[PDB]
Each structure stands twice: as C-alpha cells, then as structure tokens.
Amino acid sequence: QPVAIDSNFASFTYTPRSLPEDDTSMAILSMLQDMNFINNYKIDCPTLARFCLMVKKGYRDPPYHNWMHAFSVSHFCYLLYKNLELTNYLEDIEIFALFISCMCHDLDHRGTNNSFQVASKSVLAALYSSEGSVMERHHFAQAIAILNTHGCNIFDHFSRKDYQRMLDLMRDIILATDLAHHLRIFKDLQKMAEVGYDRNNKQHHRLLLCLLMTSCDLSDQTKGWKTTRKIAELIYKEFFSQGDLEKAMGNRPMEMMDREKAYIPELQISFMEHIAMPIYKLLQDLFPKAAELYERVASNREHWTKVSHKFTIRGLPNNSLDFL
Ligand SMILES: COc1cc(C(=O)N2CCC[C@H](c3ccnc4ncnn34)C2)cc(OC)c1OC
Numbered sequence: 092q093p094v095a096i097d098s099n100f101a102s103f104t105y106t107p108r109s110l111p112e113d114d115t116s117m118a119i120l121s122m123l124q125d126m127n128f129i130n131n132y133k134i135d136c137p138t139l140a141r142f143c144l145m146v147k148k149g150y151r152d153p154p155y156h157n158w159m160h161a162f163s164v165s166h167f168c169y170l171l172y173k174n175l176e177l178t179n180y181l182e183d184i185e186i187f188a189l190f191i192s193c194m195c196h197d198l199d200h201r202g203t204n205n206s207f208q209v210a211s212k213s214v215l216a217a218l219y220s221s222e223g224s225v226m227e228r229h230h231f232a233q234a235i236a237i238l239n240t241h242g243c244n245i246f247d248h249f250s251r252k253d254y255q256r257m258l259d260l261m262r263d264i265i266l267a268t269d270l271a272h273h274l275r276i277f278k279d280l281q282k283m284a285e286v287g288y289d290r291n292n293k294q295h296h297r298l299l300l301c302l303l304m305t306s307c308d309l310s311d312q313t314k315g316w317k318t319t320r321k322i323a324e325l326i327y328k329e330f331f332s333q334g335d336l337e338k339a340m341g342n343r344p345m346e347m348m349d350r351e352k353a354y355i356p357e358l359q360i361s362f363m364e365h366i367a368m369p370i371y372k373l374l375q376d377l378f379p380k381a382a383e384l385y386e387r388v389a390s391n392r393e394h395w396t397k398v399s400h401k402f403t404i405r406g407l408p409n410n411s412l413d414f415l
C-alpha cells in the first residue's frame with residue numbers, strides 16, 4: 092500500500108486516530124515510502140518492519156500516552172513534509188530523524204510525568220533525575236534498546252558518521268519533547284523568528300527541529316473540535332490518576348492533576364493560549380503555509396470559551412442533589 096490508505100491522508104484535516112490500530116504499523120511504512128526515506132538511506136525492509144513493531148509494542152495503554160499517540164505525532168511530522176517544504180530549511184537526514192524520533196518519543200510511558208517519577212522514587216528517577224527530563228531520557232533509552240535488539244537496527248548499514256548523527260538527532264529531539272525544555276528555549280526560538288532563519292547556522296537547525304517535534308507532539312489541537320475534546324478527556328483521565336496516587340502518597344498534586352480542583356475549561360484555555368498557540372505562531376512566522384494550523388488551534392481556543400459555561404451545574408445534575 093501507498094498513501095491507497097485515504098485521499099485526505101496528506102491533508103492537515105485528516106485524523107490519524109480514525110485509522111484502525113491494526114493498520115497503523117503499515118501506515119508508518121507508507122509514510123516512510125512517500126517521503127522516500129526507505130530508498131534514500133536504503134533501509135532494509137524486514138528490519139524496518141521489525142523495528143516499527145518493536146516500537147508499537149514498546150508503548151503501554153494509559154489513556155493518552157499510548158501507541159496511537161505516537162502514530163499520530165508521527166503522522167503530523169509526515170504532514171509537515173508534504174505541506175511545508177522543510178527540505179529548504181533542514182537536511183533530509185534531520186527530517187528522517189524527526190520522524191523516527193516521533194515514533195519513539197513516549198516509549199514505555201507509564202501515564203505519569205517527570206515530577207511523579209521523582210516523588211514516587213521510581214527506578215527511572217534514580218537513573219535520570221539529576222540530569223532532568225526523566226521520562227524523555229527513558230524514552231530515548233528504550234529506542235536505543237530496540238535498535239540494539241537483533242534484527243531491529245534500521246541504521247546498521249549507515250556510515251559510522253551518519254549513524255552517529257542519527258543518535259545525536261534522535262537524542263536531542265526526544266529530549267525536546269519535555270515541555271519544560273521547550274519553555275526554556277522559547278526565547279531562543281523567538282530570536283530565530285526575529286533575525287530570520289539561517290540555513291547554514293547549525294544551532295538554527297537544532298532549534299527548528301525542536302519547534303517541529305513539539306508541533307507534532309501537540310498536533311491533536313490542530314484538528315477539529317471533535318478530536319480536541321476527546322483528547323482532552325484522555326489527558327485528564329490520565330492526569331487525575333496521577334493526582335489520586337499522589338494524595339495516597341500524602342502530597343498535593345498540581346491543580347491540573349487534582350480532580351477536585353481541576354477546572355478543565357480554564358486549564359484548556361490557558362494551555363491553548365499560552366503554550367500551544369505561540370508554538371504555532373512561531374511555526375507560521377517560520378512557514379507561511381503553516382498559517383491554517385494556527386487558525387485551527389485558535390478556533391479550538393475560542394470554542395472552549397463557547398462551552399465553559401457548561402461546567403457550572405444549572406438545574407439539577409440525573410435529577411438528584413444527593414451529591415452534596
Ligand atoms: C507546562 O504547562 C502545561 C503542561 C501540560 C502537559 O503536561 N502536557 C504534557 C502531556 C500532554 C498535554 C497535552 C497534549 C496535547 N493537548 C493538550 N491539551 C491539554 N494538555 N494537552 C501537555 C498540560 C498543561 O495544561 C493542560 C499545561 O499548562 C496548562
């Protein structure tokens with residue numbers, strides 16, 4: 092199969108979660124073919140196949156941080172290649188690392204965040220806490236463990252030099268999915284939207300790849316409302332289990348993690364306005380064809396305000412007040 096999968100597939104309006112979970116591995120392959128990476132770097136196919144599937148299995152099934160997330164982040168990366176040029180901004184090998192990274196970026200996520208790993212004193216906190224980005228270093232570790240499983244090393248044929256460059260890229264890109272990181276380099280991304288991008292400046296390449304990894308990581312918000320609301324549910328279900336476990340542990344979770352304080356409308360708005368929209372504003376400034384994505388997140392930002400009134404109980408819940 093080539094992108095025979097759906098007519099909208101290369102479109103920003105297409106929703107990869109619509110794709111049956113059983114057909115996602117194959118869709119990965121179809122995107123690597125259409126961007127022409129498999130013939131570029133002459134990837135061994137049965138090897139790549141095994142890799143794809145070790146990646147898929149490397150994900151667990153919490154509400155949001157699961158394989159269909161990873162698939163869907165990957166899909167958006169593909170859409171950036173189709174709809175933005177990117178090749179005039181980044182070396183092909185960087186775009187291919189961006190896509191493989193997308194696939195691998197939340198591997199073996201346990202449905203909880205970095206501070207919780209530290210709070211609960213998990214094995215992952217012991218390993219990585221002192222360097223930061225606990226989960227993201229673990230995600231990167233898992234990719235590496237897969238690449239060094241027999242028959243899964245999709246780069247075993249790369250030049251020593253090219254293989255090294257794939258490891259650095261994947262590492263840096265996976266690391267950049269920590270939203271803490273993004274928020275730290277936001278002023279650096281801003282300098283690269285005032286002074287303009289410099290195709291020869293290596294730090295601009297590095298910074299651009301981070302912007303687009305995030306852009307992919309948050310790409311559920313660029314779809315229609317139906318999707319945005321469903322994904323909100325999945326996210327808070329996941330966050331509220333974390334809050335619950337933290338109370339049990341005798342700690343106060345963040346407002347957004349605590350199901351007795353979380354006001355979903357405010358939290359979504361704030362996320363849309365101050366995290367997600369400025370990300371796609373920077374994407375638009377760097378790429379004019381990225382404008383619709385900004386407009387799509389702003390639509391969704393305005394639509395939560397259109398529906399927040401609904402979170403105040405007017406009338407009776409159910410027809411009962413026994414909940415007081
Ligand atoms: C640093 O500030 C925030 C971080 C996160 C977060 O941890 N996220 C990582 C897990 C997927 C989340 C996500 C992904 C896609 N769409 C999302 N909508 C709301 N959260 N959200 C973001 C969420 C926030 O609000 C919901 C934040 O401020 C309001």
Ligand SMILES: [Mg+2]
Binds near residue numbers: 268
């Ligand atoms: Mg992540």
Ligand SMILES: [Zn+2]
Binds near residue numbers: 164196268308
């Ligand atoms: Zn992610």
